[PDB]
Amino acid sequence: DVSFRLSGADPSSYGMFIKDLRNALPHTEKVYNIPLLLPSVSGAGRYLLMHLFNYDGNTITVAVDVTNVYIMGYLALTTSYFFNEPAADLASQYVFRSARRKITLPYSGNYERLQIAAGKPREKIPIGLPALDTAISTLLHYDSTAAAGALLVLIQTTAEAARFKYIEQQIQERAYRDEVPSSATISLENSWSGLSKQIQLAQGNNGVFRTPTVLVDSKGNRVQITNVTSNVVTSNIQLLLNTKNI
Numbered sequence: 001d002v003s004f005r006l007s008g009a010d011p012s013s014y015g016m017f018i019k020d021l022r023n024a025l026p027h028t029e030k031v032y033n034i035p036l037l038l039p040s041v042s043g044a045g046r047y048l049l050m051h052l053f054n055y056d057g058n059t060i061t062v063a064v065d066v067t068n069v070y071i072m073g074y075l076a077l078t079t080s081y082f083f084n085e086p087a088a089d090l091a092s093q094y095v096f097r098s099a100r101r102k103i104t105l106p107y108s109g110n111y112e113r114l115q116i117a118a119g120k121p122r123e124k125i126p127i128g129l130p131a132l133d134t135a136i137s138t139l140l141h142y143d144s145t146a147a148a149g150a151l152l153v154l155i156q157t158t159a160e161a162a163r164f165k166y167i168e169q170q171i172q173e174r175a176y177r178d179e180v181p182s183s184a185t186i187s188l189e190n191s192w193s194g195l196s197k198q199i200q201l202a203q204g205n206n207g208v209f210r211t212p213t214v215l216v217d218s219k220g221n222r223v224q225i226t227n228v229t230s231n232v233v234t235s236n237i238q239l240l241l242n243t244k245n246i
């Protein structure tokens with residue numbers, strides 16, 4: 001398990017949480033010095049539990065698939081909540097079984113469905129540690145529309161930050177003031193699968209991507225990533241989605 005407390009949180013403690021989160025994900029090899037997530041894991045070992053505490057010390061436990069860092073569901077007091085998708089229903093066989101009741105959320109966990117439920121794209125949803133505190137509080141009591149927005153915040157401030165050092169840093173900058181994600185942040189989130197694939201394809205292609213990945217950089221300028229010498233590969237990405245899951 002890993003834990004994060006919003007009470008007394010600062011960029012340092014958040015950095016420690018994201019480090020813990022990354023380190024809780026198993027891998028047997030690195031590709032270009034980046035941990036390669038496993039093709040599969042059987043049983044309960046597939047799911048990492050993240051214990052998150054809001055500023056007041058109330059808590060949810062979030063279940064995360066360790067092969068892809070996808071959030072499957074969460075536990076709030078005695079109620080479990082899972083995304084309406086087969087991977088989450090499968091997860092519900094292994095985690096939070098002691099919950100008094102299980103609610104299946106009225107959407108899957110992918111960005112497009114969540115944004116539809118929340119009534120806005122995540123370009124317009126502020127993120128940061130204060131937003132995470134709010135998200136935790138929102139998820140404590142069921143409200144599916146509110147929860148969609150909270151989950152967009154949660155996914156980006158946990159999973160996406162674990163995947164990309166740039167995103168971790170963006171959240172650290174928003175430790176005491178929320179701000180909508182940078183266009184670069186959105187670009188990286190959208191490109192994680194693609195990048196993971198091309199980095200793995202580069203292993204037998206002399207470090208060269210079979211297909212270039214287009215990203216937006218820190219200054220809003222759109223760029224092409226063509227090989228493993230790019231800063232996105234050497235410095236930024238921290239976890240690779242196994243190509244067997246792409």
Ligand SMILES: *[C@@H]1O[C@H](CO)[C@@H](O)[C@H](O)[C@H]1NC(C)=O
Nearest residue numbers: 208225226227228229230231
């Ligand atoms: C690879 O990427 C580097 C750094 O971005 C770039 O300058 C160069 O043109 C590319 N080289 C090859 C062989 O693709």
